[PDB]
Symmetry: D2
């Protein structure tokens, strides 16, 4: 169909999409013909660009502008044609199996999942999240709890990396499996250690999950350790499924996305209906992360109240203790699901409120109608804080309207201007570690 | 009195909104079916080989879909006590039960009533086949990369002592060569193979036997599955049952099943003698003990006179040579593997096989419909055999079923019209089958 | 598609062999041991025998001969005129392939080596520590003892020929036993040694147990005549009946004795003489005797004989169930966790009962010389352990001659009431069809 | 300060009379070997690379053999605390420890003919069989990876790069259990196995009682074998490998490449397939240059049918290695040889025998081109094992002052190449001790 020089390879499916119905295959193909192709292409490039020697992002992706991918139809199932893929993703002309699987992964979540809902109620949003993970063969039936979600920051310095490896090698010396946001630095070090420790302790089925969104994976290649890759429709459905599959959470330094994620966490942990649930939240870093955490906690205790630190707990420069506590909490998390009658792998009990599930358009009017009142209940005040925060993080990676920072005025944030005064040094502090301007009186 | 069972195999990871949907559907009129089938599942291997008498004893039995946050459970109010060893359900029985929950409630209920999958008109043949595939994929029944070894084994409900022995032997041979059996879940001809194949898999240290039994809600409800069946599948109607028999077999051995097997072959030949399927490899062997000779042959004549010597290519008869039937099968696998390899086709499912729409949809033997059934030699062989199958479906047991009798006492017998010699051959077959104990209800 | 010279590769036993050991196989194969290795190998290949014959079945293949090949990697086996039923489409049946290399394992590699070749010193073969440590290295080299194995092994004894009831019933015991995820070990033979495994199969099937272990133990003279039954997964051949019985005891976590005619009497008296010994008052080895309806009286006379000879203290080590298939499994399954605990507290292994003190008396083999028979001390002043040990050697010889015609009938210098119960049991067994041979 | 350990993998099912053998062997003079090797195994993974001083901290340590009816247990008096997690011994550390109980207490003590070349080879096999390292029915993927104890960072990176490429092709690594070049190949291999989903890595590390006494096994070694001497350690290196890859190990690579070319160039081994790739970074081009020159002159250019030199192409190093594997299988197939043990390879009994560098013997060593190539290299290795060892050991400093320097007989041109290679080896910083 094309006479040019176009290095091709035909890949068979590995670990997803393997048993496909015919009428599903058609659907896969008709979707790869829609406008969705760009995402499907750009994600598939980042998937084959994993663990690239050159530690770049935009420039790495621009080199392969000759790249393309096609969905090939066969009576049995389906195959992926790879025109001009990066050479590093192949050994002796065979695709590396990790990558293969993570490729067919992107077929699954971007063209099979993301297609059927986006190219076509908080109960629907959860059962749908469950369904995605079930289809991802990620909820293992009869699995004792060992999953420790690790949130963290895109860029991090050398000490912070070192310490997050140590937490990992510990987590792993205790036979605990890790999830992250499939990205780099903080989302990577914990697995990198947990492997070594998984090794030493002869653990034989290391789960290193990695949850992400269309807009993140299109630019950010999954770090190489990720052995299971899940892509969810939006951040909103990403954070929800983070929480539901976790048996522990360990926030790291990181800066902006972390802070935003913490508020998401807390406003589900402080809701009444969830005073019985057991999800250990240990924040941690290295010695030089002392002041950073400090001001974080100061911010929460001001906004949400001191009663908010019911739910968290800060260990500093004790890699071993963080893994020890996470290991001890695992029985309790089982039991706490035992007597609810709740799946060990999916926390159906945790009540996440529709405000936490509803997506925040980065529209200017959205922040201009935002509310920050101490009279608002702790839950509502925290959800609005998180939605403003996930909008700022989207203002550099989604680029849906980058010039709307001050297009007809600054984001009218009506309410206690002292909440913003606390974020003054907080936001500049993230800029300090390289992680009324935007608000309004 | 009341035991609560956990899932085993089927229904292990359920979404809440789904568990839920079971309990509603469990309350619908469908309930009696769900109960009947679950009582049958628990009465497998019953020391009493009684059909209706065995189930009528357990009238106090009843079953309840219980909801928990994790998943779903089953409440067993007065279960037959045999099915419990030291208080625990027999793991086999457990998994068969949760199979009835899968195909009876999550599968039958859902596609017939709630339009959750919209795009399913269930007349379009593409939709019927793809569905037959979704049913099977969900029963974890199709395996990816499973090199071909499934010998589907059609037979007869009641069979004499010799036929059993002979069919057990074929199974032993089949399983001495590491071939897995699939039957129609029942007793006799559908039990005897798996029963021997078991000793075969054993001697040959074959591990992970697959003894599939495929069935339909009316069959299972009256007839418990035989105790050997390892994977239970319940297809909505015979039509979907046969159609799935085809697609998942890599070989087919038709044992002697009385006048029933006659429409069986015809159905098989219908798809086989089709020009788009002149390339598909599907070993069709018939076989039987010494005495089954006469019975296979009188069949043979009829087929060749109605369809031709060309029909004799697709099948093969063998008699009292058990082993050779295992031998030809084990041989034909690699060719069947290949036949799929070049057509770019799944090993476990035969997508390419064109089963014809008139064979997918059901046929009702209305006295008007019967006589309009075109049966003459000009009409191509495909249509000839398929109408011959529908014509045999109605006239066979046209006197056993009291529906046929009452209707052939009102509107008269089946005055079918087509070609004189054909109704001669269609007769012959029945006069011989009657000679072998295997106005009339029919007319020219 | 097969010939009459076929070359079989190893399966499951003798897989990794050093060249110097490979040589040892061939030199022992050319020595006088050959007939044994020949007869046994024919036997193994004649399992699943469609024809229900014994000696007539094996005498038909006089052309069969087997030879030890040599390659650099290991050993292979040369089958010259094997029987055809043990091959399918020119492949050897994988069952028979193991059991063949099994016989190669124990008859030539073991029995050859330990008897004479001083390649292994420190083999007094009289010291009872040596016999026991030897029985271990056998079941070890036979990959028979599994590390970290929760106890599920139930040894079954019984009669090689049994009516159709005794078989049907022993089948049900198996079915139930199996349904509880228990593994059976018998003496490899027919009838009472087949039915437990035969049923045990179906229920292992119903309960999705995925590693049946139908062990069968035997000794060279028996297997030469009796082909193992088709169910046997592990074949193990022990040098003599004595070392076979010791290893029975060591591997069992339960012993059921079925209706084995007068053939079980020495069997029970063998168990008792280790169970009633002192240092074994803490050990946990359930001993049920069972049978179907008609076996009732057959145990009856039996139990009487033991009570009166050894005492009612022998009823401590056994129990008796009749026609309750289901129960004999239920109790057996129940006893497993206790058997784990008793080996646990004692610091002992689960697969091998080191701590049972088996009498050196019972380990050594018995000569029923008329002098030795008379000198056999059969008095109740002697302790119950030695009383049962001497009562067994008495029954093994008197029941199972040319010498009672040369010298005389077996005038045992025993206590008369012991001799009185002895003859009364023999007469009661004659009522059940199960000057005399004694005096 | 005491813990008790159960057996993991090694020594798990033992007969009672064997157990007794373990105890009395432990109480003898072999105790010190056991203890210092046991100590080193518990010291794997330590951040401190002061191999010796590390052991000097834990001089309180001691180790007792515990009897039980079931088997054996290991009492640990004052064990290093880092080798535990929440009181649980690290499983890796558990296993290698019992492997020292295996090869040092059980094996070494008991075996101490050993004079007949066939007896030595069958024993090396019985040692590898008891170590459960020979897998029956195993496609050949073992690449033995020789190298040097301390290498700079560019050889460490390069050796790692090799491994990753080896791994990425589903190939297992065998090394000398140490660090430096014996670690980076496995360390790489690790990352790669993962990427390709290779789920059964076999990072065999073989060694001798003297080596492991002071040196903790590097943390990647899955399976630890300890052979009695070096002579048997090498012979074993040879029979289990399917290829060999020689990293830049300084002058320590000289006798090695000779020993190997000895068995390769002997006649009866003209049909065996054992690839030999020598690789390294760019800094190693001169270093391999003089090595290859010295050989082409002494043994002939026929010797370069047996060794190939690749420099700075890690991919190809593996690519060829991975291509060789099917050929090494077939080569064992048609000979009727094991795929796990190269029984057919003829090792000459002199290469199996230890060489004592007595002034008399090294002078008696025949070193002239008149003798044949197989013998020449053998004597050349026995030459270098004393010559270069001269400038380091006292037998080549102290003995050459007492009875005079080493006046070797043979041919002058050979001795010229020898000295010329050495002068090379001094120039890359890797009458003297030799005349
Ligand atoms: N609550 C809960 N139960 C689960 C889960 N996964 C598996 N199970 C098992 O379901 C089985 C049914 O026992 P129930 O007592 O009725 O469970 P329930 O809490 O919902 O009532 C339990 O097995 P069991 O008989 O109790 O054995 P075991 O759990 O003690 O080992 C339990 O282990 C889960 O994610 N949540
Ligand atoms: N058509 C088809 N291919 C399948 C099936 N299952 C697995 N395969 C794999 O697909 C490979 C065929 O590659 P292609 O030759 O391109 O098939 P294609 O023309 O239809 O695209 C098979 O090669 P292979 O030679 O069969 O490898 P192997 O399975 O013997 O290892 C096998 O690895 C199936 O059910 N149908
Ligand atoms: N007696 C015996 N023990 C064995 C055997 N195999 C493994 N073990 C284990 O030994 C462990 C007990 O620790 P030890 O320190 O050795 O006991 P000991 O004092 O009697 O020597 C148990 O693990 P655990 O987890 O502590 O006990 P459990 O819960 O598994 O039963 C037990 O399972 C065996 O063949 N026999
Ligand atoms: N040389 C050698 N042979 C081994 C090894 N391991 C297993 N075998 C097998 O021994 C079996 C006997 O076949 P032969 O044809 O006699 O082998 P040979 O030439 O090497 O002597 C072969 O099985 P097969 O059924 O005949 O063929 P295959 O498909 O299993 O490979 C072969 O694979 C080994 O480490 N080395
Ligand atoms: N045993 C084992 N098992 C796995 O699954 C692994 N995945 C990645 C590694 C490597 O990660 C570390 C990288 O840290 P680095 O040395 O580059 O600074 C290496 O020390 C390696 O052990 C690894 N090791
Ligand atoms: N799961 C399992 N595993 C083995 O290893 C087996 N070996 C033999 C059998 C058979 O036992 C019965 C034979 O008795 P039959 O009724 O045929 O006379 C068959 O119905 C089979 O189940 C078997 N089953």
């Amino acid at each position: 169909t094309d006479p040019a020089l176009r290095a091709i390879t035909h890949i068979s499916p590995l670990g997803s999409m393997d048993m496909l119905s015919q009428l599903e295959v058609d659907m896969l193909k008709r979707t790869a013909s829609s406008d969705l192709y760009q995402l499907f292409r750009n994600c598939s490039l980042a998937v084959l660009n994993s663990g690239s020697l050159t530690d770049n992002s935009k420039e790495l992706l621009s080199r392969f502008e000759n790249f393309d991918i096609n969905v090939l139809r066969r009576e049995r199932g389906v195959k992926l044609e790879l025109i001009n893929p990066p050479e590093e993703a192949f050994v002796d002309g065979r695709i590396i199996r990790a990558l293969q699987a993570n490729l067919f992964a992107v077929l699954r979540d971007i063209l099979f999942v993301y297609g059927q809902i986006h190219n076509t109620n908080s109960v629907h949003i959860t059962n749908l999240v469950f369904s995605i993970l079930r289809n991802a063969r990620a909820l293992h039936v009869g699995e004792a709890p060992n999953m420790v979600v690790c949130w963290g920051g895109h860029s991090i310095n050398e000490n912070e990396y070192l310490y997050a490896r140590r937490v990992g090698n510990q987590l792993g010396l205790r036979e605990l499996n890790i999830c992250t946001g499939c990205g780099p630095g903080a989302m990577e070090a914990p697995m990198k250690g947990a492997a070594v420790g998984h090794a030493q302790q002869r653990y034989k089925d290391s789960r290193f999950i990695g949850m992400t969104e269309p807009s993140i994976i299109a630019a950010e290649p999954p770090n190489p350790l990720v052995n299971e890759l899940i892509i969810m429709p939006d951040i909103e459905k990403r954070l929800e499924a983070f929480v539901r599959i976790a048996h522990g959470i360990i926030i790291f330094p990181g800066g902006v996305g972390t802070a935003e994620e913490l508020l998401y966490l807390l406003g589900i942990l402080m809701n009444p209906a969830n005073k019985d649930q057991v999800l250990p939240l240990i924040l941690t870093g290295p010695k030089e992360s002392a002041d950073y955490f400090r001001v974080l906690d100061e911010f929460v205790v001001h906004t949400l109240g001191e009663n908010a630190r019911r739910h968290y707990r800060i260990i500093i420069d004790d890699a071993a203790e963080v893994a020890r506590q996470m290991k001890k909490s695992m029985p309790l998390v089982k039991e706490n699901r035992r007597d609810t009658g709740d799946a060990y792998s999916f926390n159906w009990s945790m009540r996440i409120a529709p405000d936490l599930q509803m997506p925040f358009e980065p529209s200017h009017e959205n922040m201009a109608n935002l509310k920050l009142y101490p009279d608002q209940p702790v839950e509502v005040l925290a959800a609005d804080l998180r939605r403003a925060f996930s909008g700022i993080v989207a203002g550099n990676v989604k680029e849906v309207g980058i010039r709307a920072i001050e297009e007809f005025g600054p984001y009218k944030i009506n309410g206690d201007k002292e909440i913003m005064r606390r974020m003054d040094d907080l936001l500049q502090g993230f800029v300090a570690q390289h992680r009324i301007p935007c608000y309004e009186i």
